[PDB]
Design a protein. Structure first.
Lengths: 202, 100, 10, 247, 275
């Protein structure tokens, strides 16, 4: 048939290391290309590199393709990972006349190296109102996993890496909020497993 | 424009032997432009089911085609190729001469 | 197998 | 001469069955242009592509779409009678030739978010609020994290940005990559989106510093029909702000 | 023991008769294997050798799409050249294209070609280096500048050094039985009195594949370049070719003449004599 398969739905790797994103394909086409694309979190799509079915392994900058034609396997490898490489990566097959077939992609999260973790849960109050507050889980290192709210009146985001560029300082955070009566920061993230030295202010 | 008259050859696929099946061929080459009419004739009469090759051309860009039909030759049956081209005022007829 | 139609307008 | 593919519109909410056209253009004299649709979580499905002027071919999912290619510049996508399952993110791509050389680029337009609905009654703009840094983070880290929250909006056609002292900032910002549903069980759930901006405690402590969280909401246009009592949820900006505060 | 793949395109405007006619044929060596004719009902690339009938429906669809795109460009190109040469829409004109590649006996690229003609004469050609163009006249020089600006040369070279070689390999394998054959010529000589003083000696070569062949006359061992007629190598229609060379000789001197036949299928050259 005509199918492109990216079997890893998602992958994480530390900054500065290398990652290999696999792509296997089935096709009755015997002359073709393989395209690799990078989709940013903004949803912007970006072409990276193409591999010709008659060519040696494609290479460009930190990208290289391991074209294994008999196996119909065209893994993309990115070297010297940067945080900017976090994106969803798509593998695609094209014929000699503009037709193309896309795989369903692989999400790559590059994890920063948090050198001075300081896990903490803070409460932040609305710049205007008195009712409203938000809870911020921040400064944990990249081993920590934030869990989805299992309670539908409590909202909890995924973790997010910010980069204070002038200070060369990266930190992870997640946000939680709710309209319910007894919602408190002490309980906000109780559905996750967080370091046991997490700072909760007195 | 450069106009080139067709060169015409009429011949059998195999050495001719009366009563045994063969193919009668009319090969037209070296002509330009590409429109051309070609008929194979049995005793002056147009042969019906005649086939021809797909149009191609040579290094000098002149075209060539092969027209052909199955036939079993005899002693008194005469065959020929009749060709018309813009370079020609009248249909040109080349008779089949097996002993050449 | 054909070349890809492209880059050949006169 | 900056190479780019332009799509218009980038965001569109429309009613089922009303004909529409999305334009795609490039000024690089490229021969090859292609349309794709990307459903959430999946790859790009080719709709139609054009190897050159007056040449078009069907991709994998042509049904309900038509294209034309009268000139090199333009490759419009036509939806004669849009239906809900044509809700998708649409990309137009171009390249100089249909099978680029190794050093040649495939260019993509920014995407068109199309949403086809039975009616526009559920469209709601966001409310936006900025939450000031906690004194405990300032004490503990000598840094101050502001949080922006956009809530109650539908659909999730929003862009959030931070503006410090009047200039957009990206250093020290992290925004959720996707809004979350406020009622995940409802197909027409409104959405919420959060963002953080972190600065040094001393920067937060200067009362001359001004912080603004801005949400551009892409909603109805002036010429959309609207009969409900509440304000027509047009395309609009919604902001909240804070000033720095001396210790 | 090299081999070749070649495509031959013919596009002809027909003022007074709808759109142009677009024809293309593909060959491996001297064996045709595909055809396209926009007048035919198929509107599809079609097989013309049994060893290409293997190709699945996607090959045929892809070849048809590349032909359809080529034809649209030829259509535009007929209009452009009409303007270049201040011709009219009432005239019929012809664009011809040949391109292809040669490979050694190991299957490796030897050389590539691409050449374009207008009304039977050179228009523009890719040079041997597959990197630069020769324009035949001032109009074609306009095309040359366009083609340089879009790096058409590299675009052709990538096909010729790459896809062309790869397809040629595949077809030679898949049709190995028939494409890898060399049929030597079966030869004979006829004698036809013209006068009582003159006779035609005709040297015949039949049933040979591939078509390349040399038929030379000698007189007393000296090459006869003087009344030596020579027809165009012709197809038998069964995949073999035929050719003859004739000389007019003085009646009685028939034995002073020899006919020499050189063909790939011949361990060493043949010498024929009327005796």
């Amino acid at each position: 048939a005509q199918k492109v398969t990216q079997a890893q739905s998602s992958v994480s790797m530390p900054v500065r290391k290398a990652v290999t994103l696999n792509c296997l394909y089935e096709t009755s086409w015997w002359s073709y290309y393989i395209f690799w694309y990078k989709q940013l979190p903004s949803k912007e799509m970006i072409f990276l590199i193409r591999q010709g079915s008659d060519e040696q392994n494609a290479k460009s900058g930190r990208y290289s393709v391991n074209f294994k034609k008999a196996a119909k396997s065209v893994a993309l490898t990115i070297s010297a990972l940067q945080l900017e490489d976090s994106a969803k990566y798509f593998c695609a097959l094209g014929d000699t006349a503009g037709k193309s077939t896309f795989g369903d992609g692989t999400t790559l999260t590059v994890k920063p190296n948090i050198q001075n973790p300081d896990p903490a849960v803070y409460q932040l109050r609305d710049s205007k109102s008195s009712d409203k507050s938000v809870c911020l889980f921040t400064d944990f290192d990249s081993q920590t996993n934030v869990s989805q709210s299992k309670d539908s009146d409590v909202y909890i985001t995924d973790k997010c890496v910010l980069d204070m560029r002038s200070m060369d300082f990266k930190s992870n955070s997640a946000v939680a909020w709710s309209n319910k009566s007894d919602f408190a920061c002490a309980n906000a993230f109780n559905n996750s497993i967080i370091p046991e030295d997490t700072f909760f202010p007195s | 424009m450069i106009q080139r008259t067709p060169k015409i050859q009429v011949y059998s696929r195999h050495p001719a032997e009366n009563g045994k099946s063969n193919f009668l061929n009319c090969y037209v080459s070296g002509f330009h432009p590409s429109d051309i009419e070609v008929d194979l004739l049995k005793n002056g009469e147009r042969i019906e089911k005649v086939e021809h090759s797909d149009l191609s051309f040579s290094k000098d860009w002149s075209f060539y085609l092969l027209y052909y039909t199955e036939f079993t030759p005899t002693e008194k049956d005469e065959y020929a190729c009749r060709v018309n081209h813009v370079t020609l005022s009248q249909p040109k007829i080349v008779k089949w001469d097996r002993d050449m | 197998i054909l070349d890809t139609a492209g880059k050949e307008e006169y | 001469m900056e190479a780019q593919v332009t799509q218009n519109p980038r965001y569109l909410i429309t009613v089922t069955g009303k004909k529409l056209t999305v334009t795609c253009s490039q000024n690089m004299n490229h021969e090859y242009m292609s349309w794709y649709r990307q459903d959430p979580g999946l790859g790009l499905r080719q709709i139609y592509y054009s190897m050159n002027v007056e040449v078009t071919d069907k991709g994998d999912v042509p049904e309900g779409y038509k294209v034309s290619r009268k000139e090199k510049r333009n490759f419009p996508l036509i939806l004669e009678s849009p239906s809900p399952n044509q809700t998708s993110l649409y990309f137009c791509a171009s390249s100089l030739v249909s099978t680029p050389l190794p050093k040649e680029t495939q260019y993509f337009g920014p995407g068109t978010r199309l949403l086809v609905l039975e009616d526009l009654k559920n469209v709601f703009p966001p409310e936006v609020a900025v939450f000031e840094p906690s004194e405990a983070e300032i004490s503990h880290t000598q840094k101050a994290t502001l949080v922006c929250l956009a809530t109650g909006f539908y659909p999730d056609h929003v862009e959030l940005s931070w503006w410090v002292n009047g200039k957009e900032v990206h250093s020290g910002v992290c925004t959720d990559p996707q809004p979350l549903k406020e009622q995940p069980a409802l197909n027409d759930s409104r959405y919420a989106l959060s963002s953080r901006l972190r600065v040094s405690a001393t920067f937060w402590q200067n009362p001359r510093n001004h912080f603004r969280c801005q949400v551009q909401f892409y909603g109805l246009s002036e010429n959309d029909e609207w009969t409900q009592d509440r304000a027509k949820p047009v395309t609009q900006i919604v902001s909240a702000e804070a000033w720095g505060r001396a210790d | 023991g090299s081999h070749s793949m070649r495509y031959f395109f013919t596009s002809v405007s027909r003022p007074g008769r709808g759109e142009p006619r677009f024809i293309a044929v593909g060959y491996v060596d001297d064996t045709q294997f595909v055809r396209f004719d926009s007048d035919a009902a198929s509107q599809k690339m079609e097989p013309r050798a049994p060893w290409i009938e293997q190709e699945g429906p996607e090959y045929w669809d892809q070849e048809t799409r590349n032909m359809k795109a080529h034809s649209q460009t030829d259509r535009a190109n007929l209009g452009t050249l009409r303007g270049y040469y201040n011709q009219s829409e009432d005239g019929s004109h012809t664009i011809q294209i040949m391109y292809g590649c040669d490979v050694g006996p190991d299957g490796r690229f030897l050389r590539g070609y691409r050449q374009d003609a207008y009304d039977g004469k050179d228009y523009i050609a890719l040079n041997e280096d597959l990197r630069s163009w020769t324009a035949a006249d001032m109009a074609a020089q306009i095309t040359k500048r366009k083609w340089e600006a879009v790096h058409a040369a590299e675009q052709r070279r990538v096909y010729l050094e790459g896809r062309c070689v790869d397809g040629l390999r595949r077809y030679l394998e898949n049709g190995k039985e028939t494409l890898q054959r060399t049929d030597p010529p079966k030869t004979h000589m006829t004698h036809h009195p013209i006068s009582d003083h003159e006779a035609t000696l005709r040297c015949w070569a039949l049933g040979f594949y591939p078509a390349e062949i040399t038929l030379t006359w000698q007189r007393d061992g000296e090459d006869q370049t003087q009344d030596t007629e020579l027809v165009e190598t012709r197809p038998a229609g069964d995949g073999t070719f035929q050719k003859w060379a004739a000389v007019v000789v003085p009646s009685g001197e028939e034995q002073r003449y020899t006919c020499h036949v050189q063909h790939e299928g011949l361990p060493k050259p043949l010498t024929l004599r009327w005796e």
